[PDB]
Design a protein around this ligand. Structure first.
Ligand SMILES: [Ca+2]
Ligand SMILES: [Ca+2]
Length: 542
DNA sequence: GTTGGGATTG
DNA sequence: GAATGTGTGTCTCAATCCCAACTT
DNA sequence: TGACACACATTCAA
């Protein structure tokens, strides 16, 4: 509904300029030649090229290329044919033709070799691939097919550019029009004109290779040839080693699901990924090598990766000490968790077990809310908003940031320690209550990692602000900062407020067929050692 | 005719 | 009865087409 | 496009 018909080409020329000035030193010979050559195309053909780069395929029937802004599809496509950037009569493997053509058209083309039953499209290919392994020009499948198919052949450079400008490959160019329409509305940070996503080109190239390995894997191919291509020595850049170490982790998971534990051990062991060490032990155990398992677990319990790894090691060590001759480690006492049982009539009809306990528990002198990590994450997101989106160098390179780029980075707290000391300071004097309504009214709806506007109504915001102790908020917000990925979930299903007694209690509801998860248990027990009001409500039916 | 999942699209 | 492995649904931007599968 | 929580199945060491 915005004016201009060509906005998407304005936006693409826009990103070409931005990579021209910000990434100038990072471009190559072949690449900088592309940005130059692109600017010389007619407006009609530059527009078509942006359409194909923005749609799903690398392959298109001329028929699917109808656009009003560009009059003729065939006319606009010639200057692109000249650079070899768009192929006509490209080569299509059997499977790819099944994408381009309807089942009607495919039925006739292979009309000979389908006699058996009329059957599905996914099924045809299964029975039709052994007959047609080879790939052919579109002309060599049916010689008279008069509709071109186009293959955009320069797409690799475009993803390299998209990756450099955005700094993660999941965001589309559609980020532009959505922001303009006011659909996804982002916070605007003012960062330096020299700040950018990637420093070295070898950083871009490495990200791109890891992305290639999961692409080739989520299709597959064996890892046996993939781990040939991955580096066997850690990456220079920390964020890359983050990405690589995670990739290794997920490959090892796929191994474990195929019951290949001897390889699973080798893979987990060379990933630094969270809980990788644990899956390594549990993998060795699954593969019946108990001797190595026990030694790894003993090594881990000495300086454990996390409270969650402590929590799992507290199960693995004694079982291993069981299948080995060793004396068991008597596990710890737990403070216990405040039990509440409810016998409720049947659904009918569902209506989750959680919602039902919310209506049951409301006194009405009691108010009860369904918020899962919504309320603590959100209050934190509001209070520390000015610290989170603080303009720290290399934390923002574009307009579309939903969270700082350094968010999971280990020293992220330390770099902002100023504004965090200030925002966390508002708990010590009274100023947090007003400050949170201030960031809340001003910043409502803006995309942020922690703030669930959907969840946070006026009633819940001010009920929580006056029933939640300043000091308990200090505790939870400090714990949240200790491991951002590892502590932002586990929180309970419900929180209830008694505003007259300015009390609250958080309640986890477990229907039959759920137990308390490990991270949930950490959250409950952390509160319970701090003498915070949490409780677990287990429901039975009758 | 209906679903229902996808792409596409501003 | 724990403790595991493993499968499923919910978020969605919303509106519109275009197909493939099912149901009449 | 995952991250989360839940639901259900399987396999064990008390
Ligand atoms: Ca829940
Ligand atoms: Ca629950």
């Amino acid at each position: 509904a915005l004016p201009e018909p060509f906005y998407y080409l304005h936006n693409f020329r826009a990103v070409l300029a931005w990579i021209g000035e910000r990434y100038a030193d990072l471009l190559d010979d072949q690449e900088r030649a592309f940005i130059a050559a692109f600017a010389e195309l007619p407006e009609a053909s530059q527009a078509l090229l942006v359409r194909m780069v923005m749609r799903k395929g690398t392959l298109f029937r001329e028929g699917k290329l109808a656009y009003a802004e560009i009059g003729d599809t065939r006319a606009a496509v010639q200057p692109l044919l000249a650079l070899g950037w768009v192929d006509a009569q490209p080569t299509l493997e059997l499977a790819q033709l099944f994408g381009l053509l309807k089942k009607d058209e495919l039925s006739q083309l292979f009309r000979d070799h389908l006699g058996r039953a009329n059957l599905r499209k996914d099924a045809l290919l299964e029975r039709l691939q052994p007959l047609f392994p080879e790939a052919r020009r579109l002309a060599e499948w049916q010689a008279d097919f008069a509709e071109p198919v186009y293959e955009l052949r320069c797409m690799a450079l475009c993803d390299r550019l998209r990756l450099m400008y955005f700094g993660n490959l999941w965001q589309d160019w559609s980020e532009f029009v959505l922001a303009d329409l006011g659909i996804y509305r982002y916070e605007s940070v003012e960062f330096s004109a020299d700040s950018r996503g990637f420093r070295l080109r070898a950083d871009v190239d490495a990200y791109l290779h890891l992305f290639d390995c999961r692409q080739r894997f989520d299709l597959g191919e064996p890892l046996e040839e993939l781990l040939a291509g991955l580096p066997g020595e850690p990456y220079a850049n920390p964020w890359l080693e983050g990405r690589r170490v995670k990739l290794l982790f997920q490959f090892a998971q796929h191994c474990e699901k195929q019951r290949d534990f001897d390889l699973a051990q080798r893979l987990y062991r060379q990933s630094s990924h969270p809980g990788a060490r644990l899956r390594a032990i549990r993998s060795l155990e699954r593969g019946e090598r108990f001797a190595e398992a026990h030694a790894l677990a003993r090594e881990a319990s000495c300086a454990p990766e996390s409270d969650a790894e402590r929590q799992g090691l507290a199960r693995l060590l004694p079982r291993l000490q069981g299948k080995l001759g060793l004396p068991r480690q008597a596990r710890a006492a737990a403070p216990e968790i405040d039990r509440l049982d409810l016998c409720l009539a049947f659904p009918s009809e569902p209506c989750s077990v959680e919602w039902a306990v919310r209506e049951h528990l409301e006194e009405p002198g009691c108010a009860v809310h369904y918020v899962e990590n919504g309320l603590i994450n959100s209050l934190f997101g509001l209070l520390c908003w000015e610290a989170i989106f603080a303009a720290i160098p290399g934390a923002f390179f574009h307009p579309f940031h939903s969270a700082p780029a350094d968010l999971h980075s280990a020293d992220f707290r330390q770099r902002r320690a100023a504004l965090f000391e200030a925002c966390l300071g508002r708990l010590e004097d009274g100023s947090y209550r007003d400050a949170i309504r201030c960031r809340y009214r001003d910043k409502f709806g803006l995309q942020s990692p922690f703030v669930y506007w959907e969840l946070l109504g006026e009633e819940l915001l001010e009920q929580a602000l006056d029933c939640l102790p300043a000091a308990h908020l200090r505790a939870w917000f400090e714990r949240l900062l200790e491991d951002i990925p590892g502590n932002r979930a586990g929180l309970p299903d419900l929180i209830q407020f008694w505003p007259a007694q300015r009390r609250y209690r958080m309640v986890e509801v477990k229907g039959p067929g759920d137990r308390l998860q490990d991270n949930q248990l950490r959250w409950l027990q952390f509160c319970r050692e701090r003498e915070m009001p949490v409780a677990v409500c287990y429901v039975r039916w009758h």
